[model samples]
Target: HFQLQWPGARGAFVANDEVYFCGAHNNVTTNRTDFPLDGSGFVSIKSGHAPYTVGAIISLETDADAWEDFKNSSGGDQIAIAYRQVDNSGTYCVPFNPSSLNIAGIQDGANATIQVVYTGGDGNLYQCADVTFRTTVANLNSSVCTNSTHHHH
Candidate 1:
């Protein structure tokens, strides 16, 4: 990876437009609880909008490096996986949670898009599709993967 490394299936998604996920959507939202070794949370969508209007929370550890990471980066120059607020409370950030976050009004769709803002390797902000997926009731065997190779950001 040019910036940060990710799991294999994420790498496999480089050639295409979407990441093939596991059947239950379990791999993205949760499945990580090994503290000290790891800490994070992901943004997932139910419909085409953000479900959190207020009081949604995810506690994570932030270090001093975050400031420099912000200062030294430019638009499209670097990559950062962090959260931004969706409110009139202005802007805010939080730690990536290591647990499940409940999103309201989520349902299945064909080729539905889920998006989030990610800082690029150049330190610029970009709206990226976290994933474009077709929702299914059952987790498809083919949906389980960790092979996306190309770094997207």
Candidate 2:
């Protein structure tokens, strides 16, 4: 049941196994989103189990065409955002700085892939958000970035 609650996720959630996994997943979607390249971006997730830690990574657009590509290129792309440990079975949102992460050619107007990982009771699980880095971020709020009911499916 662990899945990215906002900014959309790869593939369709016809079943829990399709959305949650013990390792990296290859799920994908055509619905790419936008993220701020100069400011903070938000990542919201729903964890099925309690006490999980979340972290994120960025792979330059087309850098990772699959899970294996991400696994290899993401070694140094882990965003410096603070990791969060949730003690309850609930959704949570946190802030991330895209410009702060040291990627080889990251910049505004660049396209990239964002992978958010949550590990805990069920083991490490992965999901992705396809994004375009922009100068301005819209609807940056608790509704999409906070532990609120306003998150989209």
TM-score of each: 0.22, 0.74
For model 1 the local lDDT of residue 85 reads 31
Candidate 2: stretches off by over 4 Å: 14-30, 71-83, 148-153
Error of 1 at 83 (Å): 5.4
Misplaced by over 4 Å in model 1 are 1-100, 110-112, 130-153
Q: List the residue pairs that clash in candidate 2.
A: 11-28
Native-to-model Cα distance after best TM-score fit, residue 135 in candidate 1, in Å: 5.3
Clash numbers, per candidate: 34, 1
Cand. 2 TM to true fold: 0.74
Model 2 lDDT at residue 79: 55
lDDT of 1 by residue, 21-104 (tens): 211121233222122112332332221122223122211212211212222224231223344434222122333322222332
